[PDB]
Amino acid sequence: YEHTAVMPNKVGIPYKALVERPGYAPVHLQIQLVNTRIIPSTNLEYITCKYKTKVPSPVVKCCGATQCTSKPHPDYQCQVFSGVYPFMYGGAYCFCDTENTQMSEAYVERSEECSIDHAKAYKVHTGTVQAMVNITYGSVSWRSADVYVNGETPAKIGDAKLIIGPLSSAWSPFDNKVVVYGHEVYNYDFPEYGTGKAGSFGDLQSRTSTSNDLYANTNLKLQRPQAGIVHTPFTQVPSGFERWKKDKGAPLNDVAPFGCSIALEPLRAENCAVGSIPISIDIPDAAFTRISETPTVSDLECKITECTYAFDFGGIATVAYKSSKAGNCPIHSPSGVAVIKENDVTLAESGSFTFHFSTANIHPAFKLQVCTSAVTCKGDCKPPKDHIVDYAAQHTESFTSAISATAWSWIKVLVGGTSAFIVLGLIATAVVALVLFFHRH
Amino acid sequence: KAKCIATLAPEPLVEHKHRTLILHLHPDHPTLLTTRSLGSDANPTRQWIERP
Ligand SMILES: *[C@@H]1O[C@H](CO)[C@@H](O)[C@H](O)[C@H]1NC(C)=O
């Protein structure tokens, strides 16, 4: 027996409903999301990290000269400095005073830290949505499984075939390009591979952390050695990866809307409370007991004894009843006015039972289903005194939830008063025309 | 990769008003405070607090 509905995209707040099959006792159904995961399709573009400048031993040619040869090294530099007269611990290195030459070389390579301290540049595309759903129904205990939130793939959870529809809003916190660093994810528009600029995030780029083909773009310039000294001085733009670390700003972990959590294995946004989720669950015939074998109730009377429209279950009500074939009975509230804490009650041949509920309404009025029967509960609720709480609201707001009977009275008096005044003017207008007509005739 | 011991700032004093969260922050070191709402418009806040 298939039951179809739409449940809010909320984690930790269950969707509760009765599966009503004429001739059989209603099966109470409860579907709770354990987590919701938005898993985009990602493609690693390149890996950037802090660079290391490799400086081989310079070639010092005494009484002669050398020429630079281009080499296949990242950001390779080579310059020949003539007219050098270097000294070592053993004295002057060269004999000639001005005919000596020093060749300096330098190139960029990944630092040792790049194996543990690097940022991954990903291109992000629309992917899939998954969730873990906790389901209980009838007398069946809680069962859970990972499902695909696409409305097409059925999940079998405890002999029930669950199809969770696509999210009503195709929203994702990830932009087209993101940077993953450590546990953090950033919506950073990084330069494409091979186009990085010195001092910026992508100055050093590698397709993989173990790739042998490295791209480097720094203003690495060889400087002339100090007089009499054998060394290879140079200037270079400070690493843009270390610069980015300072200018990262807030990560997506800390700014994502809808309370999303960002996980990395795989990269995904979790528990984003966006929109609603269509659902469809097919419950086997074994779960449905014939009405003739279950209790039924009549002459129901509901009393709300206490109520606060707090986020918690601040409402309390009592239902008087008469029944036949006394036994366990499911409880449900079809409307959104109040969320019922209880799932079922134990009935006697006669008596009453109590239940707790959460409502945002000042004057809640809602239908309570009891073994295919229904009773209307009405009462007034006081406001809570606690300004801030550490838990989410169980109930749902509406336009008219906050309008009190006194406010409705003023609205009715205002609208009725103005309408009656206009009607009075129109009746007077109609009568005077009728009187004038009789003057002529 | 290794595990390092980082400091813990003193727990804030929290005062509640209608739709307002009041935090009294007394850090020992420059401490980062960030906030965001859980709605469709998460207005983020990011500030380093060095003094009470
Ligand atoms: C399902 O809900 C029950 C409630 O008692 C809980 O014990 C169980 O751990 C939940 N399942 C998951 C996967 O969280």
Side-chain angles (χ1 to χ4, degrees):
Chain A
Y1 189 82
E2 184 182 6
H3 172 74
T4 60
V6 177
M7 68 177 288
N9 185 12
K10 296 179 183 182
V11 176
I13 300 173
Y15 163 86
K16 301 172 71 164
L18 298 179
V19 181
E20 301 180 60
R21 184 175 180 166
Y24 304 81
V27 177
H28 191 282
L29 170 69
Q30 187 172 0
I31 298 172
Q32 184 180 315
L33 304 178
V34 178
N35 61 62
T36 301
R37 312 182 296 269
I38 295 169
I39 307 166
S41 176
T42 59
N43 183 42
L44 179 65
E45 188 67 21
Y46 60 80
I47 288 176
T48 188
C49 59
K50 191 181 184 182
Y51 64 75
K52 178 175 66 167
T53 301
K54 177 61 173 179
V55 176
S57 294
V59 180
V60 182
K61 176 63 181 176
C62 299
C63 304
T66 57
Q67 299 81 36
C68 274
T69 299
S70 297
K71 295 183 182 175
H73 297 293
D75 206 6
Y76 180 81
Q77 302 298 320
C78 185
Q79 188 168 349
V80 181
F81 300 98
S82 62
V84 299
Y85 193 64
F87 294 86
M88 304 296 288
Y89 80 82
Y93 188 74
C94 294
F95 182 87
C96 297
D97 301 291
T98 59
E99 302 181 6
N100 318 311
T101 300
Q102 178 177 321
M103 182 193 291
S104 290
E105 298 184 49
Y107 54 95
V108 178
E109 56 177 352
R110 291 189 298 269
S111 66
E112 292 77 8
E113 295 82 4
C114 289
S115 65
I116 64 165
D117 186 14
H118 62 261
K120 290 186 175 181
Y122 286 94
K123 285 187 175 181
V124 185
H125 312 287
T126 302
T128 188
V129 182
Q130 296 183 11
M132 176 169 278
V133 188
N134 212 8
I135 293 187
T136 178
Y137 62 87
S139 60
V140 182
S141 64
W142 289 93
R143 300 289 293 274
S144 66
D146 284 288
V147 308
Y148 291 85
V149 178
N150 63 12
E152 297 177 351
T153 305
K156 187 177 180 181
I157 304 175
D159 305 322
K161 301 191 291 289
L162 180 77
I163 296 170
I164 299 297
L167 304 185
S168 68
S169 178
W171 180 90
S172 176
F174 306 108
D175 283 340
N176 293 340
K177 287 195 280 183
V178 305
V179 175
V180 179
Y181 177 60
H183 66 289
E184 295 171 340
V185 184
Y186 294 85
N187 278 324
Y188 186 74
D189 186 343
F190 55 79
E192 302 294 307
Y193 184 79
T195 69
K197 293 181 181 179
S200 184
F201 170 76
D203 58 357
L204 186 77
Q205 306 174 352
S206 180
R207 289 296 191 185
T208 67
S209 61
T210 62
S211 175
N212 291 324
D213 293 300
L214 178 68
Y215 168 85
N217 183 4
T218 69
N219 296 334
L220 177 60
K221 310 295 177 185
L222 296 171
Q223 301 298 313
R224 186 177 176 87
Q226 294 293 305
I229 297 150
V230 179
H231 67 151
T232 302
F234 62 85
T235 57
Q236 193 171 22
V237 169
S239 179
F241 178 61
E242 294 296 307
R243 182 267 185 92
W244 176 77
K245 288 180 177 176
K246 299 181 181 70
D247 297 334
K248 295 188 296 184
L252 188 55
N253 297 68
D254 296 340
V255 305
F258 299 104
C260 300
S261 296
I262 308 299
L264 301 185
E265 300 179 1
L267 176 67
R268 64 195 188 272
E270 296 191 339
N271 304 338
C272 303
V274 191
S276 65
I277 318 175
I279 61 168
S280 173
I281 183 167
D282 185 337
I283 297 174
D285 292 344
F288 294 89
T289 300
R290 294 185 300 177
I291 284 289
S292 62
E293 299 177 350
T294 63
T296 61
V297 299
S298 67
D299 198 21
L300 300 175
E301 184 176 2
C302 182
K303 305 291 184 184
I304 292 177
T305 64
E306 175 60 293
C307 183
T308 303
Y309 48 81
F311 285 7
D312 205 340
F313 287 88
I316 307 173
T318 304
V319 180
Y321 65 89
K322 295 183 174 73
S323 71
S324 180
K325 298 180 176 175
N328 190 272
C329 184
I331 299 298
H332 178 54
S333 176
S335 71
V337 171
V339 179
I340 310 304
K341 190 173 183 179
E342 286 77 6
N343 303 328
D344 60 82
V345 295
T346 302
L347 305 180
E349 291 78 6
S350 66
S352 65
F353 66 82
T354 64
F355 69 87
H356 306 74
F357 63 87
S358 180
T359 182
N361 297 67
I362 298 178
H363 302 276
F366 56 89
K367 183 183 179 183
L368 192 84
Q369 290 183 295
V370 188
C371 284
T372 77
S373 296
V375 63
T376 301
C377 302
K378 298 186 181 181
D380 301 349
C381 301
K382 62 173 71 70
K385 301 297 182 181
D386 299 311
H387 297 301
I388 303 293
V389 294
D390 57 332
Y391 50 85
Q394 298 291 307
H395 53 62
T396 305
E397 291 290 355
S398 69
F399 178 79
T400 61
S401 67
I403 305 175
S404 67
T406 301
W408 279 120
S409 181
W410 283 113
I411 291 166
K412 290 174 182 179
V413 169
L414 173 64
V415 174
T418 59
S419 180
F421 194 25
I422 292 169
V423 168
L424 174 62
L426 293 171
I427 294 168
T429 299
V431 171
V432 72
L434 185 61
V435 168
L436 290 163
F437 159 77
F438 281 115
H439 285 164
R440 299 198 305 270
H441 297 270
Chain B
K1 296 299 299 193
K3 296 293 185 67
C4 287
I5 301 173
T7 53
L8 281 173
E11 292 181 0
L13 302 164
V14 186
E15 174 182 356
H16 299 158
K17 292 288 184 182
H18 185 235
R19 296 180 181 172
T20 305
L21 177 75
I22 304 166
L23 305 175
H24 308 278
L25 304 167
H26 310 286
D28 299 301
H29 308 283
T31 300
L32 181 64
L33 177 76
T34 58
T35 76
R36 62 170 176 163
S37 68
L38 305 179
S40 65
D41 182 10
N43 181 12
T45 302
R46 182 181 181 89
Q47 57 183 303
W48 286 91
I49 298 176
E50 304 183 355
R51 62 176 293 155

